[PDB]
Structure 1
Amino acid sequence: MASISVQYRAGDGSMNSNQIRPQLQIKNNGNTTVDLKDVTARYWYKAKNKGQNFDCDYAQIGCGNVTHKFVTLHKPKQGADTYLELGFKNGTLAPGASTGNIQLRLHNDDWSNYAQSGDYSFFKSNTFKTTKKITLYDQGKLIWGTEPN
């Protein structure tokens, strides 16, 4: 019954640099509140069996209220062999409200370059745009977007 979506843009920088820079917002489009602790988001990309590392640079809700982990896929899919899963410690969204910006950076253990063109969830855009390629979940159940096949 919760209805949420994600707005996204890649942070400024080369798609071939040593950092992925997902910038996200989650919006409540429904007529219920949303408890962010129950919400997770997944950004799907290719890490090529390099260890991944996370930074939260800024979030309107406070970086200390965002959680993360990296999950390697059983086997690679087109556009993805891993996802970053974001979660939340606390917070709510009223109908129509947004988290506002969540600005992240990911790097490889060895600080080597990514080539992000192929990544399922990657897109360059001057503006935040709603995307179905970053998926959202309510207690682990898919409620926004489409997972890689």
Structure 2
Amino acid sequence: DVKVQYLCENTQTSTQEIKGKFNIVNTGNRDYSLKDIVLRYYFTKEHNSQLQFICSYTPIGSGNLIPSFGGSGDEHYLQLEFKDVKLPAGGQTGEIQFVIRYADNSFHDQSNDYSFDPTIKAFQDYGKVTLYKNGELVWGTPPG
């Protein structure tokens, strides 16, 4: 009913910046609001510094994103929630650029990150980024 496409922008194994794009696609016949949708990107947090999120660009308006971080060090995640943005039946958000850095600009090893796949250089359906609608997993598979 709803799915995620992904593309990897920073393919560097060890990096100060995780960087890619999401695209949320409504593949059914019912209109949704993004406010009911929760997206997660999974990575390993090896340093204690706090994490920062940046959206460089999205057609939906970056003001409409509600980012947060959660989970253990070994399975951390970026979580995206949203304000009341319409996702019509059959429609898509278009690109949601995401950047994750440490506040202290420390380096991060992406080769340990569950959701990292630098073979994906153009958008494609991607099961290692999850979607939840109202508590229920509707797209993808979380770590384990």
Distance 2:21 2:8 in 1: 6
Q: CA deviation at 1:16?
A: 1.5
| Range that drifts further, 12-21 or 95-104 | 12-21
2:100 aligns to what? Answer: 106
1:54 aligns to what? Answer: 53
SS of residue in 1 equivalent to 2:15: coil
Deviations 1:47-84 (A, max 9, x none): 125321111110110100011000023x73xxxx2010
1:84 to 74, 78, 86: 78
Distance 1:42 1:31 in 2: 24
Percent of aligned pairs with the same residue? 36
Q: Which runs of 5+ in 2 are unaligned?
A: none
Deviations 1:16-50 (A, max 9, x none): 21000131000001111111000010000001253
1:6 aligns to what? Answer: 4
CA-based RMSD: 1.4
- Number of residue pairs the alignment of both structures matches: 142
Q: Which runs of 5+ in 1 are unaligned?
A: none
SS of residue in 2 equivalent to 1:117: helix
Length-normalised TM-score, structure 2: 0.92
Deviations 1:112-148 (A, max 9, x none): 1111122111111220111110000111221111110
Length-normalised TM-score, structure 1: 0.89
Q: Which amino acid aligns with 2:82?
A: F
Runs of 4+ in structure 1 off by over 4 angstroms are: none
SS of residue in 2 equivalent to 1:64: helix
SS of residue in 1 equivalent to 2:106: coil
